[PDB]
Amino acid sequence: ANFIEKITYLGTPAIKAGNEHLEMIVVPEWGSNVISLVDKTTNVQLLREPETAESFHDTPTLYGIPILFPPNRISDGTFSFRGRTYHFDINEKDKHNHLHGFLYHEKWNVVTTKQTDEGVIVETEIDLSELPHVQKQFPHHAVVRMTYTIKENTLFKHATVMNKGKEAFPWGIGYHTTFIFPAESSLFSLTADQQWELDERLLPTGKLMDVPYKEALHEGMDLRHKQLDDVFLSSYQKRGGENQAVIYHQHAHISIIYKADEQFKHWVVYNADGKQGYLCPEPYTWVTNAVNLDLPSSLTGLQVLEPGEETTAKSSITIELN
């Protein structure tokens, strides 16, 4: 059994979709944010939802599943690529950075709604050539299409990035996925052994370091007394195996398994002061400030789309009852 339904969410049009296991709400006008994800077996909301529309507009990267194109910081908003210098707006004023890209608070179009016995599918899309202020910063005909598919106990969340223009461009994507996380009774794990050393502007120095608590991080750990805003290197390319973050909710007896494909070479983990009741395990295709690191792209995750090319970067959220 399954459904797709147009609804109003905090005064804004939205799409509710689900099956017998999982229900999502995506808000196309709000950066195609998947604002709600409910496990129907347990009736548990998994994502942090805003309590007013104004609250969402105040902090649109701290609710639901915000789309970060590109993710995290670029020093001084400035980088060079094939001889061309780019200047993105410096929205992080104290650290003098560009932060979190172009798409989390723009209107995306709904382009597909389909249901079968195999999956419920919603696709949204945005064409950056239709955003004049973005074109000032990033003058490329980039198009991003999100494919959300609910099948059994999984939300598949795929991003297809397309170059419809006449010149190549560099790109990365990430998500600022904001899960409810009661630190007194949930545990967190991640496939990472190393992390990037950061400077005072939260930019990588270029050095990798051991994660001191990596064993605990593999096992599932208590994050009480830990403030995280850390850039982890996925262990997948070195060790093979999995590329995923897991939240275990001990009271609800459910595990959230957040998988990402090989493009997602880094994870940022953010929990603010640790007392806000949420946790953001953020898979990124490129490391913070990738465009300004003199390191190979196998490590930074920097990607380039030539004219006419596209690529699909895949991730998924699976809910398991323990």
Q: Is 43 annotated as a binding residue?
A: no
Give the C-alpha separation, 295 to 267, whole Å: 18
Q: Is 76 annotated as a binding residue?
A: no
Give the C-alpha separation, 98 to 88, whole Å: 6
Give the C-alpha separation, 203 to 209, whole Å: 14
List the determination method: X-ray
The H-assigned helical ranges of the chain are 53-58, 132-137, 214-219, 236-239, 297-300
Q: Is 229 annotated as a binding residue?
A: yes
Q: What are the domain boundaries of the chain? A: 1-322
- 243: closest CA among 315, 151, 147? 315
Give the C-alpha separation, 274 to 239, whole Å: 30
For 6, phi and psi rounded to 5 degrees? -75, 130
- Tokens describing residue 131: 């955003």
Residues 140, 128 contacting (CB under 8 angstroms): yes
* Cα–Cα separations (whole angstroms), residue 48 to 23, 38, 178: 15, 11, 6
Strands 154-163 and 142-151: antiparallel
Give the C-alpha separation, 293 to 276, whole Å: 33
**Residue recorded with tokens 């949420």:** 278
- 229: closest CA among 31, 95, 139, 84? 95
Q: Which fold has domain 1-322?
A: Beta-galactosidase; Chain A, domain 5 (2.70.98)
Resolution to 1 decimal place, in Å: 1.5
For 288, phi and psi rounded to 5 degrees? -40, 130
Residues 61, 229 contacting (CB under 8 angstroms): no
- 81: closest CA among 142, 167, 15, 166? 167
Measured between its terminal Cα atoms, the distance across the chain in Å is 24
C-alpha 97 chain-centroid distance: 19
Q: Which residues are catalytically annotated?
A: 176, 282
Give Dmax (Cα) for the chain: 54
